[PDB]
Amino acid sequence: RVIEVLSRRTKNNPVLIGEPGVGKTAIAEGLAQQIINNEVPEILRDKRVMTLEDRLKKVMDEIRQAGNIILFIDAKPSLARGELQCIGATTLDEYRKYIEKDAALERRFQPIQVDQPSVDESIQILQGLRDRYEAHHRVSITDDAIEAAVKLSDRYISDRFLPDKAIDLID
Amino acid sequence: MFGRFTERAQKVLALAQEEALRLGHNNIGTEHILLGLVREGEGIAAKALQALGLGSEKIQKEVESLIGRGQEMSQTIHYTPRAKKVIELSMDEARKLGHSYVGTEHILLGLIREGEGVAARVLNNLGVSLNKARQQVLQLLGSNESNANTPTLDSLARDLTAIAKEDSLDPVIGRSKEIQRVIEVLSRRTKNNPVLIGEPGVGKTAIAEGLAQQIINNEVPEILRDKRVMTLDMGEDRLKKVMDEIRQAGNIILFIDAILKPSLARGELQCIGATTLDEYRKYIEKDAALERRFQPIQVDQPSVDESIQILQGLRDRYEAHHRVSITDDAIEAAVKLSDRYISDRFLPDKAIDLIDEAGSKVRLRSFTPNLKELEQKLDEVRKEKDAAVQSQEFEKAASLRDTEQRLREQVEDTKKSWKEKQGQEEVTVDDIAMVVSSWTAQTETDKLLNMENILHSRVIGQDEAVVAVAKAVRRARAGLKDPKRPIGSFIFLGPTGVGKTELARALAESIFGDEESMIRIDMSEYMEKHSTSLTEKVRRKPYSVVLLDAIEKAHPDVFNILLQVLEDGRLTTVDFRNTILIMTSNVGASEKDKVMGELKRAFRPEFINRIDEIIVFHEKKHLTEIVSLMSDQLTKRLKEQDLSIELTDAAKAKVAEEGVDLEYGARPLRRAIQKHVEDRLSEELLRGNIHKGQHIVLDVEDGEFVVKTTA
């Protein structure tokens, strides 16, 4: 759904609204993965996705002069003075802190939500970073250990997002 | 290839292959791409080489002097990884030239850039350094083509007169009599500067491009010829700087959609403003250089048909996302559904949004067989091959490699079998009506003809009432009643808990799609001269059963209001023409004739007479039929949690026993189901008697409940 929008000519630039995280940063690491290997469409090849004041609009001119580039944002608009393809980091409400003063929103920028990742998908998400937290001594393993983290959260408080919570618990 | 280039390109590329084999080699490297270019002898690339002193003669001699024959293998060959880079590059050596499409030059450009390789050496061998070469190609391509415009045209900010000069500008429709009203407000001396207010929405910004075209050629006062339209706006260090570099140049008109930053009227600083219905309220409210200088005109939500035309004009331009032009029959839906069906924008933005929702979505259903599995397989291979190769295991790979490519070509052959998922993937309506329902004809009038069957399955008893409503809705819904008035105005008389509300739900569900699209006010709240409604909830969902309970309580004031609703289906300024108004009351209650009497005496007649219709609301085996309905809703929601349960008919009987007492009715059944079923199954699962995911039956034995297992 980041791609129906990132093609348009209408509500062109997609804004990624969902309760914070993780997942969110993982969706753009998606396009990245998708354009490259490789199935994608309405003109989108050789396109980078890039991320994260006395250096401001400085670098931004290397773009009004070559345009293979989506910008990935975290937190502002130096504005659709032209190109500028960007994916939105913002909250259920935080986005209503753009379209009210309007109306670059209902125009350029345009939204989509992060459902909380699939419970089972939730599980096989840790195992990937299981290896990498093995950094503190215990995990890798146990699988029977993660099953916990994830299921506990989805119904037993239960006031976050179904992929972010679990991870915290491990820690 | 790897995309699309000129013939010349495409010919020169395949031409490398021609040379691939003519020498018998097996991979076409950068050296063949080069032979490809000098051997089509007519491309710009070809032309250049003729310059440096490099005919096909001189080159191929160096090449054969570094490779020669000639394993005729020709086992369906592929590229060098270098050369695949070389192609990826020409694509970029043309982004870098505005050349919308690659061609003979760019590929020669692309070679130099990735100089590591065989071509490069042919030449550093033929005494032709790499740069002397990129030069020759360059010196065979080039370019293409008022003072104050400098500071200005600089910023910022899109010179509309400009985009309207080379005629590189869309129509655009109109709002043609709208464009004109701007030029009065602009040819003046009083209200010098115009300001458009409407939902934002109607791409107000569209009307502005209107001047560009007309000021040019040319219908406009000699009072305005020789001027320029430009844009932005709002509000940084580039302050009064460029604005000084404009007052010093009178030929300028400007466009905004934001703040004030008003140095108004001062210079020839002349504007055109686009700001919301209200936001303007919040600027002449500033006053009074506002009410003075700048000055407004009403932007219309385009005539529905006009909408359609706008779409097409830019249809050919949304072919960008790969599916349009057409279908017309589809456009009409994009548009038409929005004017009447949700129903929360301007009639030209809405459209295009439906189109774009779909203006990738289908190009996508393209990109989604289970041959996801093949690639999965091929992987395990490389490894064996690869890791084996690290152990060697050599001939243990030879065949391993071969086993690999066996796979690959198979993959790519069915990965390009989905050019068929391309020749397959439309537009028609059904696409849209989806989009619509996801924003809120046989089995649509069948809901109507068969309404009674439908309302009956939810509302029990009460056939007197159902048929009256069915027919009334069907009257209005068929063209007979006046459209500005609600779909239906009813009064529901009768005792409590008979079906008054229940029918209102079933109506919402059947008519509006959602058993929950129902506003419900309690007139107990409106008994005093404080009778100020409601209109919020109706603005919220303007398509909903509006249910006012117990109207006998309202201050007769209220009726003056409702009356206005019944008459005009409008308040002042909400809209009801799409509601189904239902007002309940106890006026009959205690008590069809003695009743209609107590009604005429309780309500002003002016009122009773504008109401479409006055509706009157008048076993063990049913209880257990209910218990079963409930029990089934349950056994389904458990199957989801890997729990398989079943009640015997004997068991549903025993639950039903618990709603016989005429006094409390069938309320108790929900609770008694959770107690005798839910609570008991838990206690039974926890105590360890039922190893979940076996099949669990609830039965009655000696007049007592019993749990049984039968996996």
PDB file of N, CA and C in Angstrom, chain A residues 4 7-11 39-43 45 57 66 81, chain B residues 95 158 232 238 317-318 321 352-353 356-357 360-361 363 367:
ATOM      1  N   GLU A   4       0.828   1.750  -4.130  1.00  0.00           N
ATOM      2  CA  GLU A   4      -0.315   2.334  -4.824  1.00  0.00           C
ATOM      3  C   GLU A   4      -0.174   3.835  -4.738  1.00  0.00           C
ATOM      4  N   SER A   7       3.076   6.166  -6.634  1.00  0.00           N
ATOM      5  CA  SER A   7       2.989   6.019  -8.084  1.00  0.00           C
ATOM      6  C   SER A   7       2.066   7.112  -8.590  1.00  0.00           C
ATOM      7  N   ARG A   8       0.991   7.325  -7.844  1.00  0.00           N
ATOM      8  CA  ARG A   8      -0.176   8.145  -8.220  1.00  0.00           C
ATOM      9  C   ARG A   8      -0.017   9.349  -9.209  1.00  0.00           C
ATOM     10  N   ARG A   9       0.272  10.544  -8.684  1.00  0.00           N
ATOM     11  CA  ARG A   9       0.049  11.819  -9.368  1.00  0.00           C
ATOM     12  C   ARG A   9      -1.104  12.533  -8.638  1.00  0.00           C
ATOM     13  N   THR A  10      -1.894  11.777  -7.878  1.00  0.00           N
ATOM     14  CA  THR A  10      -2.826  12.398  -6.932  1.00  0.00           C
ATOM     15  C   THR A  10      -2.194  12.543  -5.522  1.00  0.00           C
ATOM     16  N   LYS A  11      -2.936  12.105  -4.509  1.00  0.00           N
ATOM     17  CA  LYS A  11      -2.378  12.015  -3.185  1.00  0.00           C
ATOM     18  C   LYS A  11      -1.129  11.144  -3.375  1.00  0.00           C
ATOM     19  N   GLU A  39      10.597  -7.384  -8.661  1.00  0.00           N
ATOM     20  CA  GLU A  39       9.228  -7.147  -9.120  1.00  0.00           C
ATOM     21  C   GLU A  39       8.653  -5.813  -8.596  1.00  0.00           C
ATOM     22  N   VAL A  40       8.494  -4.799  -9.473  1.00  0.00           N
ATOM     23  CA  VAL A  40       7.811  -3.493  -9.174  1.00  0.00           C
ATOM     24  C   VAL A  40       7.396  -2.710 -10.476  1.00  0.00           C
ATOM     25  N   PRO A  41       6.781  -1.486 -10.381  1.00  0.00           N
ATOM     26  CA  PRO A  41       6.091  -1.261 -11.653  1.00  0.00           C
ATOM     27  C   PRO A  41       6.216   0.126 -12.307  1.00  0.00           C
ATOM     28  N   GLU A  42       5.061   0.789 -12.253  1.00  0.00           N
ATOM     29  CA  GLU A  42       4.856   2.145 -12.720  1.00  0.00           C
ATOM     30  C   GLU A  42       6.125   2.940 -12.489  1.00  0.00           C
ATOM     31  N   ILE A  43       7.066   2.795 -13.420  1.00  0.00           N
ATOM     32  CA  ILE A  43       8.390   3.395 -13.319  1.00  0.00           C
ATOM     33  C   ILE A  43       8.871   3.520 -11.870  1.00  0.00           C
ATOM     34  N   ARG A  45      12.352   1.706 -10.972  1.00  0.00           N
ATOM     35  CA  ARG A  45      13.711   1.168 -10.888  1.00  0.00           C
ATOM     36  C   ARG A  45      14.830   2.220 -10.723  1.00  0.00           C
ATOM     37  N   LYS A  57      18.990  22.696   3.525  1.00  0.00           N
ATOM     38  CA  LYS A  57      18.564  22.519   2.145  1.00  0.00           C
ATOM     39  C   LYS A  57      19.794  22.355   1.249  1.00  0.00           C
ATOM     40  N   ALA A  66      18.539  15.396 -10.435  1.00  0.00           N
ATOM     41  CA  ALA A  66      18.635  13.927 -10.481  1.00  0.00           C
ATOM     42  C   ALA A  66      17.652  13.369  -9.452  1.00  0.00           C
ATOM     43  N   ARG A  81       8.575  21.656  -3.415  1.00  0.00           N
ATOM     44  CA  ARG A  81       9.067  22.647  -4.374  1.00  0.00           C
ATOM     45  C   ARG A  81       9.329  21.957  -5.703  1.00  0.00           C
TER      46      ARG A  81
ATOM     47  N   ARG B  95      19.728   9.382 -18.093  1.00  0.00           N
ATOM     48  CA  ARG B  95      19.101  10.195 -17.072  1.00  0.00           C
ATOM     49  C   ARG B  95      19.892  11.495 -17.146  1.00  0.00           C
ATOM     50  N   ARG B 158       7.528  28.705 -10.326  1.00  0.00           N
ATOM     51  CA  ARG B 158       6.626  28.133 -11.320  1.00  0.00           C
ATOM     52  C   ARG B 158       5.847  29.213 -12.056  1.00  0.00           C
ATOM     53  N   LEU B 232       3.017  29.752  -5.240  1.00  0.00           N
ATOM     54  CA  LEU B 232       3.790  29.267  -4.073  1.00  0.00           C
ATOM     55  C   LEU B 232       2.950  28.479  -3.009  1.00  0.00           C
ATOM     56  N   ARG B 238      15.331  34.568   2.420  1.00  0.00           N
ATOM     57  CA  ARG B 238      15.257  35.208   1.105  1.00  0.00           C
ATOM     58  C   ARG B 238      14.252  36.368   1.106  1.00  0.00           C
ATOM     59  N   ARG B 317      -2.694  11.020 -19.417  1.00  0.00           N
ATOM     60  CA  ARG B 317      -1.528  11.387 -18.621  1.00  0.00           C
ATOM     61  C   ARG B 317      -1.358  10.529 -17.376  1.00  0.00           C
ATOM     62  N   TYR B 318      -2.422   9.832 -16.989  1.00  0.00           N
ATOM     63  CA  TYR B 318      -2.348   8.807 -15.959  1.00  0.00           C
ATOM     64  C   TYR B 318      -2.110   7.451 -16.618  1.00  0.00           C
ATOM     65  N   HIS B 321       0.875   5.080 -14.896  1.00  0.00           N
ATOM     66  CA  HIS B 321       0.809   3.978 -13.938  1.00  0.00           C
ATOM     67  C   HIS B 321       0.310   2.698 -14.565  1.00  0.00           C
ATOM     68  N   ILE B 352     -10.739  11.308  -9.438  1.00  0.00           N
ATOM     69  CA  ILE B 352      -9.296  11.039  -9.411  1.00  0.00           C
ATOM     70  C   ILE B 352      -8.732  10.242  -8.200  1.00  0.00           C
ATOM     71  N   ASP B 353      -9.264  10.413  -6.993  1.00  0.00           N
ATOM     72  CA  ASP B 353      -8.753   9.613  -5.885  1.00  0.00           C
ATOM     73  C   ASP B 353      -9.150   8.145  -6.030  1.00  0.00           C
ATOM     74  N   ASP B 356      -6.907   6.789  -8.801  1.00  0.00           N
ATOM     75  CA  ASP B 356      -5.582   6.406  -8.310  1.00  0.00           C
ATOM     76  C   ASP B 356      -5.564   5.230  -7.303  1.00  0.00           C
ATOM     77  N   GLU B 357      -6.463   5.227  -6.319  1.00  0.00           N
ATOM     78  CA  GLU B 357      -6.582   4.037  -5.482  1.00  0.00           C
ATOM     79  C   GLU B 357      -6.402   2.847  -6.418  1.00  0.00           C
ATOM     80  N   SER B 360      -2.861   1.986  -9.496  1.00  0.00           N
ATOM     81  CA  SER B 360      -1.651   1.267  -9.134  1.00  0.00           C
ATOM     82  C   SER B 360      -2.107  -0.117  -8.717  1.00  0.00           C
ATOM     83  N   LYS B 361      -3.121  -0.132  -7.867  1.00  0.00           N
ATOM     84  CA  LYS B 361      -3.730  -1.343  -7.300  1.00  0.00           C
ATOM     85  C   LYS B 361      -3.823  -2.477  -8.302  1.00  0.00           C
ATOM     86  N   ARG B 363      -2.207  -2.534 -11.429  1.00  0.00           N
ATOM     87  CA  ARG B 363      -0.844  -2.763 -11.825  1.00  0.00           C
ATOM     88  C   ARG B 363      -0.168  -3.632 -10.766  1.00  0.00           C
ATOM     89  N   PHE B 367       1.664  -7.920  -9.849  1.00  0.00           N
ATOM     90  CA  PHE B 367       2.935  -8.288  -9.223  1.00  0.00           C
ATOM     91  C   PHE B 367       2.902  -9.279  -8.057  1.00  0.00           C
TER      92      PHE B 367
END
